[PDB]
Amino acid sequence: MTGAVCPGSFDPVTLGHLDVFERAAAQFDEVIVAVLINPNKAGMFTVDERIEMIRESTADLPNLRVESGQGLLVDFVRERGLNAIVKGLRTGTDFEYELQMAQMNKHIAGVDTFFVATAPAYSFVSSSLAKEVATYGGDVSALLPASVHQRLLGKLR
Amino acid sequence: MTGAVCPGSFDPVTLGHLDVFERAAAQFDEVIVAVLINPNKAGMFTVDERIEMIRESTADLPNLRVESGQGLLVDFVRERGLNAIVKGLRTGTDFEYELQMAQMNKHIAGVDTFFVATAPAYSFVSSSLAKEVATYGGDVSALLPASVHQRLLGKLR
Amino acid sequence: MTGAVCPGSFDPVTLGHLDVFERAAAQFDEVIVAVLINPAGMFTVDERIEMIRESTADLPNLRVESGQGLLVDFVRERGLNAIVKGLRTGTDFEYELQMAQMNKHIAGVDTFFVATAPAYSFVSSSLAKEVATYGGDVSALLPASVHQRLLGKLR
Amino acid sequence: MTGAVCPGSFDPVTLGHLDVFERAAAQFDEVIVAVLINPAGMFTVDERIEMIRESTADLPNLRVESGQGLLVDFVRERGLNAIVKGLRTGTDFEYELQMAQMNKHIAGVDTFFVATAPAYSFVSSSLAKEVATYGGDVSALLPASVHQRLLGKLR
Amino acid sequence: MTGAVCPGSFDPVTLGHLDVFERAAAQFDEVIVAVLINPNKAGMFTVDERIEMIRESTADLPNLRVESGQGLLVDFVRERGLNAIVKGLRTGTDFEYELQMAQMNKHIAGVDTFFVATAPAYSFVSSSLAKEVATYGGDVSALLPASVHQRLLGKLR
Amino acid sequence: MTGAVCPGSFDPVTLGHLDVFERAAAQFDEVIVAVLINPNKAGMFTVDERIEMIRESTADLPNLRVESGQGLLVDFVRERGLNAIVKGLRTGTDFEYELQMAQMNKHIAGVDTFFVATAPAYSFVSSSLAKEVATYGGDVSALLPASVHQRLLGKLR
Numbered sequence: 001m002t003g004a005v006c007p008g009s010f011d012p013v014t015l016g017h018l019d020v021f022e023r024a025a026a027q028f029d030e031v032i033v034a035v036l037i038n039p040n041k042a043g044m045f046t047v048d049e050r051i052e053m054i055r056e057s058t059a060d061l062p063n064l065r066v067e068s069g070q071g072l073l074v075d076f077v078r079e080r081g082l083n084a085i086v087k088g089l090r091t092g093t094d095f096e097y098e099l100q101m102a103q104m105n106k107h108i109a110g111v112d113t114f115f116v117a118t119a120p121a122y123s124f125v126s127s128s129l130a131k132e133v134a135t136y137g138g139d140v141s142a143l144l145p146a147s148v149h150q151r152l153l154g155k156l157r
Numbered sequence: 158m159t160g161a162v163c164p165g166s167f168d169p170v171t172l173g174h175l176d177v178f179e180r181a182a183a184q185f186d187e188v189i190v191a192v193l194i195n196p197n198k199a200g201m202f203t204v205d206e207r208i209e210m211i212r213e214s215t216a217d218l219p220n221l222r223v224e225s226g227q228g229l230l231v232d233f234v235r236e237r238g239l240n241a242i243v244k245g246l247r248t249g250t251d252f253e254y255e256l257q258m259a260q261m262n263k264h265i266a267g268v269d270t271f272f273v274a275t276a277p278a279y280s281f282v283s284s285s286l287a288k289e290v291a292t293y294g295g296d297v298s299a300l301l302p303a304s305v306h307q308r309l310l311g312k313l314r
Numbered sequence: 315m316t317g318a319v320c321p322g323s324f325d326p327v328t329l330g331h332l333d334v335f336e337r338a339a340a341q342f343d344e345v346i347v348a349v350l351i352n353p354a355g356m357f358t359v360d361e362r363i364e365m366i367r368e369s370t371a372d373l374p375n376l377r378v379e380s381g382q383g384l385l386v387d388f389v390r391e392r393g394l395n396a397i398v399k400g401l402r403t404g405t406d407f408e409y410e411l412q413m414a415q416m417n418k419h420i421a422g423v424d425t426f427f428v429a430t431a432p433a434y435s436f437v438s439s440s441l442a443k444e445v446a447t448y449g450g451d452v453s454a455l456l457p458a459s460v461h462q463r464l465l466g467k468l469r
Numbered sequence: 470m471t472g473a474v475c476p477g478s479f480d481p482v483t484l485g486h487l488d489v490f491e492r493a494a495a496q497f498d499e500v501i502v503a504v505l506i507n508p509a510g511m512f513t514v515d516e517r518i519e520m521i522r523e524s525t526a527d528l529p530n531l532r533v534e535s536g537q538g539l540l541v542d543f544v545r546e547r548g549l550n551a552i553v554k555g556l557r558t559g560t561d562f563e564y565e566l567q568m569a570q571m572n573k574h575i576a577g578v579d580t581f582f583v584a585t586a587p588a589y590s591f592v593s594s595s596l597a598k599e600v601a602t603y604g605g606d607v608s609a610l611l612p613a614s615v616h617q618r619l620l621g622k623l624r
Numbered sequence: 625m626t627g628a629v630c631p632g633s634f635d636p637v638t639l640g641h642l643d644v645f646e647r648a649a650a651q652f653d654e655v656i657v658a659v660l661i662n663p664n665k666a667g668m669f670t671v672d673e674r675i676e677m678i679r680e681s682t683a684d685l686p687n688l689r690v691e692s693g694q695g696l697l698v699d700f701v702r703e704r705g706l707n708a709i710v711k712g713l714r715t716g717t718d719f720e721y722e723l724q725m726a727q728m729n730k731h732i733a734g735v736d737t738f739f740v741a742t743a744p745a746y747s748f749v750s751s752s753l754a755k756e757v758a759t760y761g762g763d764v765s766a767l768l769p770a771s772v773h774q775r776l777l778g779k780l781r
Numbered sequence: 782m783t784g785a786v787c788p789g790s791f792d793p794v795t796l797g798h799l800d801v802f803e804r805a806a807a808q809f810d811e812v813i814v815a816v817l818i819n820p821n822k823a824g825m826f827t828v829d830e831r832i833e834m835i836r837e838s839t840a841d842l843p844n845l846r847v848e849s850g851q852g853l854l855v856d857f858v859r860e861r862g863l864n865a866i867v868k869g870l871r872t873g874t875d876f877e878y879e880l881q882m883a884q885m886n887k888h889i890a891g892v893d894t895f896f897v898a899t900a901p902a903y904s905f906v907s908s909s910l911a912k913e914v915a916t917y918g919g920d921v922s923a924l925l926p927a928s929v930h931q932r933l934l935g936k937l938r
């Protein structure tokens with residue numbers, strides 16, 4: 001039994017995230033999406049809302065489950081008997097910062113990190129830029145799962 | 158069930174490569190090291206020598222095997238019933254170049270690529286730089302497995 | 315009838331920015347400098363506009379306007395669909411690439427990047443303000459008028 | 470009377486290149502694609518020119534010409550002083566920045582960079598040829614005509 | 625005769641910083657570690673604590689001394705009759721940012737900056753990441769000098 | 782007595798190189814410029830021509846001397862009782878490749894490397910691009926020392 005954790009705030013989940021989830025679920029026996037709860041910055045969607053949106057979008061992935069997490073990521077990973085993290089990367093700058101984090105996580109807890117390159121179509125989408133664009137009436141419907149877009153239009157009204 | 162291919166020319170394999178092999182073998186049920194040969198340019202080591210040096214330094218990894226090939230990596234991967242490549246990266250520059258090859262490989266064959274960050278200790282070792290330094294007499298004994306170092310010095314002498 | 319928009323906060327405009335404006339004005343019939351209203355900086359929007367107008371008096375095909383909201387709406391409402399932005403580093407390119415691709419996706423607005431003049435590789439509004447605040451001489455990095463205005467805000 | 474030159478070896482032209490040509494043609498009155506003569510590639514200069522002309526038939530303000538020597542001389546001899554070049558990565562920007570600054574220094578010719586369309590992030594003439602040589606399907610990455618021509622060179 | 629200044633906030637000093645100090649002290653007749661304080665934002669450690677932690681881990685470097693300051697680094701450097709800054713770098717991203725500050729510092733005051741590449745083992749340690757990991761209970765004992773680690777845990781508790 | 786080696790092919794020396802030489806000579810008691818002899822690629826100027834051009838350009842630097850070298854750079858450095866290299870850097874990409882080399886040189890011989898950021902004015906000049914531009918009649922006189930430019934015009938006729 002192999003497995004990996006896919007961490008993020010997912011506020012909201014985007015099609016770029018979903019592409020990573022699908023690719024991880026195709027290669028590991030189990031995948032856990034870890035939705036981070038951050039006591040400091042409370043974003044647009046509640047943790048439960050974020051989990052619901054991810055579950056809707058990943059309904060066809062039976063070996064993927066969604067859970068909330070808090071604190072040190074490598075504790076979350078090890079408490080679930082795993083020792084791999086899977087994350088998506090878009091740029092070389094992304095890789096430099098994430099490499100530091102990955103080496104740190106491997107040093108402190110023996111947890112490894114596997115990165116996957118973004119699908120070309122989603123190279124420019126992020127949760128933050130999608131929210132910003134949508135806030136001013138830009139159309140981000142092609143960048144988000146169908147249900148997320150509906151939920152996002154409600155938060156904006 | 159799960160599996161990945163670790164590709165390279167491995168001319169010769171380094172401790173950086175071995176670290177990647179070990180980490181892939183810890184996370185996938187089977188790992189194949191693909192020694193990719195250019196039929197139009199001989200390297201320093203013959204295919205048999207490259208394979209022998211890898212086998213001698215991976216004897217403790219029961220789910221790893223070593224095979225050579227040429228042509229498209231994605232054909233090597235698919236003909237073994239697999240759909241994943243695992244590659245080590247050191248730098249952001251590495252990532253931008255490998256991203257392009259990864260996206261091409263996914264485009265033409267649906268094969269995914271997972272990258273892993275180098276161990277810090279091997280951030281500066283490459284087959285090419287180790288060969289160049291050794292050619293001019295520098296001490297590279299700590300960067301190569303025992304199965305490689307003196308065979309390398311032999312080739313140079 | 316070609317045209318492009320040069321966006322920024324310009325707080326204050328530097329010689330790096332001016333170089334980009336001049337180069338955009340040399341290649342497009344119409345240039346609009348778009349000054350962001352983002353409501354915490356040093357100069358008011360009006361002051362920023364004035365400083366740019368002062369420094370671009372020799373560019374007959376350039377005008378300066380403020381705006382809020384999506385840049386692509388600013389651009390499209392003026393009948394244009396190009397943005398001209400200056401870049402210093404590869405890091406800059408990676409971040410601006412994402413914005414550029416988003417802007418093209420949502421509004422069909424293209425982005426043209428121009429490399430910084432070598433002499434202004436290290437110049438930014440932020441660093442100029444910081445250095446001047448602690449007494450450093452930035453007079454060679456800012457339009458003559460801007461510099462005097464900056465001294466006034468600090469004293 | 471605005472204008473820009475789009476330079477390259479184009480061996481062969483890809484959909485990435487074509488995207489850049491279309492975007493240059495939308496923003497400048499005149500575009501010249503400059504095909505480098507560099508005397509070792511797959512297609513002759515004439516074949517490369519033909520392939521680009523075939524693929525740009527819907528761009529009335531674009532023409533295709535070959536050239537040798539300094540790009541800035543090609544540009545200036547045609548009365549222009551802008552180059553439009555597509556970029557994929559930050560690494561690309563760092564290398565092209567140096568060329569751009571050199572070209573501005575020696576000839577006053579400016580360079581405008583445009584970000585790759587997302588769909589063509591991984592497309593290059595070199596990689597397309599390599600993949601096709603070993604049997605990979607690159608038909609979605611090249612103009613329809615180019616693709617058939619490529620099959621012909623390999624078979 | 626020759627000399628350089630090694631600047632930073634050192635909140636706290638790490639083994640990466642100490643490596644830079646040692647390498648600067650090996651190549652310049654005198655080295656001054658400049659602990660730069662923001663009078664408007666307190667860090668984790670007071671100035672006296674930062675200086676004490678550096679002194680305790682540099683006692684074997686006879687030509688190094690530690691002083692605090694604020695405002696323009698180039699003024700700190702020139703008022704000591706020096707004209708060189710020595711700074712460690714980990715990444716290409718680091719280099720682009722530090723290049724801009726170095727060129728500004730040379731412009732306004734004629735002060736030069738020499739960069740040195742991180743030791744591989746410390747490629748992933750930073751004061752900020754060590755503090756964040758420790759805040760959530762991760763083991764950072766191997767990344768910080770003895771003069772720092774338990775004082776850090778004390779601050780957090 | 783402190784010191785450093787400034788290595789390169791210098792074919793020909795440019796104003797960017799000279800700026801690095803000046804800055805090194807200002808901070809180290811002695812500087813040796815090492816002009817590399819490469820048996821494979823014989824460039825535009827002979828080693829003796831390259832040395833002569835550098836000596837002309839550095840006439841005002843009494844603590845800098847110019848010598849040819851061959852083979853492993855760290856041997857050249859240590860044979861002269863030194864253990865520091867000084868090199869100029871223009872970009873983040875430069876730093877990534879040079880960092881590998883610097884870590885390798887420190888690993889194999891204990892020789893350190895100090896990098897300096899290019900002067901802004903010379904960010905785009907290199908020996909290779911200057912030669913290429915000049916070959917086709919471009920004016921590179923503002924990028925090269927006065928004497929080099931004269932010598933370059935002769936090699937081109």
Ligand SMILES: N#Cc1ccc(Cl)cc1N
Nearest residue numbers: 014016088089118125126
């Ligand atoms: N949002 C988002 C996102 C996350 C991961 C990757 Cl690889 C691509 C993306 N656009």
Ligand SMILES: N#Cc1ccc(Cl)cc1N
Nearest residue numbers: 171173245246275282283
């Ligand atoms: N050689 C080599 C090598 C290969 C992969 C990684 Cl991650 C690190 C390395 N030094």
Ligand SMILES: N#Cc1ccc(Cl)cc1N
Nearest residue numbers: 328330400401430437438
């Ligand atoms: N400020 C500023 C600035 C803006 C654009 C460019 Cl290309 C260079 C700069 N120094």
Ligand SMILES: N#Cc1ccc(Cl)cc1N
Nearest residue numbers: 483485555556585592593
């Ligand atoms: N080939 C090619 C190509 C050229 C320019 C751009 Cl921006 C993208 C590409 N794929």
Ligand SMILES: N#Cc1ccc(Cl)cc1N
Nearest residue numbers: 638640712713742749750
């Ligand atoms: N912290 C820290 C640090 C500082 C400088 C260098 Cl080169 C490496 C580091 N890890």
Ligand SMILES: N#Cc1ccc(Cl)cc1N
Nearest residue numbers: 795797869870899906907
């Ligand atoms: N040529 C050359 C050169 C060498 C070093 C530096 Cl820092 C800048 C340059 N232009």
